[PDB]
């Protein structure tokens, strides 16, 4: 009841970054993902519970090194069933009105992203995502490699985390809100909260709160956290 | 026929770089943009000629830069019009079968990722675009901020160049071509079917003081 908690989700393994460890584990400059994205949530001053999901073998590790600042949980074997288990915790009597879901591969978000997110929910906005104009040019292509349009561009927007609702409007679009089909059911939490007519509102992003996915992404960082 | 010639544009001033210069001919560790983006597509070992389209003032110092590795002509105010000049020098006769037109920008283009490209037009493919999967996902959103839908992330793609196409194609797009962001566009306009190969991180377009930093540390070390 104007409490924000935020739920990171960093129970994946990191394939495509191919670096030995699970990538959210995965040191930059003495710190690992999962602790810097947890301090960009503390920092922002806004943040009253982090809720960090971390693979099942990982529960002791995760404890180590975050200590007091974050409870931890085992993730599922996709995004969606880690927040989907993570969003369990925020049940009953006393759920907060706000949560956050923040990717830990985001790990350079600045606080000031957090704090926007959480200004907007402040605000009256059920939903909230942070979001960046357009770098490349962007094509819709079918299944054979065919483009089947370039869309028209000045309508769209890069979206980022970390995303803000309300509780209640989280929790029903997780829950049951998954009618829809088999496994890995999106990276996008308002993909979800749109799915059953929710309406998302957006806000400035930051080109900070780029996602760490493959060498290259790495490569940026150690470049900005090195200076 | 069978020949293959690159244009690059590389007549932009880069505004949102601010680097003093324009942005093609910003030093990166020695080499300039634009002779880093040439070196790139002759390395591929399947580019015969180069013609680059930089700034009207520029002319003699692009010369002196690249030498006998490319043809020089002045751009236009857009990056259309610049590509469109550039065109004018493949006409008539002994028009070339391939056109590439890569931006200057990417410099890091592997030459790789060039052959690749060439590759399929050597496949029959009329028109070919390098691409990437979308590390973000899109949202479409009204004028004030409220998410209006989200497209199938998984059918959508981030474009890079060497963007190659049969010259006769390329010709009447840009030629009927109703900025324009993207060659393929123009060839899609007309109906024209591109196709897709796999792009390569490493040609990213350097815009921003960010791009630029990541090019710094990628030729660092
Ligand atoms: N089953 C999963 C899969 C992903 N994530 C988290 O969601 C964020 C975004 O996912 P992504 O960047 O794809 O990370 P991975 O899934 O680990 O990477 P990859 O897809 O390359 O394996 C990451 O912090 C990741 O750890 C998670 O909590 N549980
Ligand atoms: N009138 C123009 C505009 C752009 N370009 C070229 O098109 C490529 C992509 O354009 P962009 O990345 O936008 O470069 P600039 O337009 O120079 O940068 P900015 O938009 O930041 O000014 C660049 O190699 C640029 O030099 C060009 O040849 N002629
Ligand atoms: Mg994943
Ligand atoms: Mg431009």
Known sequence: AGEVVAIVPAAGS????????????????????????????????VVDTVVVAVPADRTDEARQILGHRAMIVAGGSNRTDTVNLALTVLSGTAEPEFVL???????????ALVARVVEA????????????????????????????????????????????????????????????????????????????????????????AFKITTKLDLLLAQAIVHH
């Open 14 to 45: 990191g394939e495509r970054l191919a670096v030995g460890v699970p990538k959210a584990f995965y040191q930059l400059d003495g710190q690992t993902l999962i602790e810097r994205a947890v301090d960009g949530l503390l920092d922002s001053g």
């Open 101 to 111: 879901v923040h990717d830990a591969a985001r790990a350079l978000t600045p606080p």
């Open 121 to 208: 929910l402040r605000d009256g906005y059920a939903a909230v995502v942070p979001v960046l104009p357009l770098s490349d040019t962007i094509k819709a292509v079918d299944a054979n490699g065919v483009v089947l349009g370039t869309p028209e561009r000045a309508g769209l927007r890069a979206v980022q985390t970390p995303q803000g609702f309300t509780t209640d409007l989280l929790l029903r679009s997780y829950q049951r809100g998954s009618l829809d089909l088999p496994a890995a059911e999106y990276t996008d939490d308002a993909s979800l909260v749109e799915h059953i007519g929710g309406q998302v509102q957006v806000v400035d992003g930051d080109p900070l």
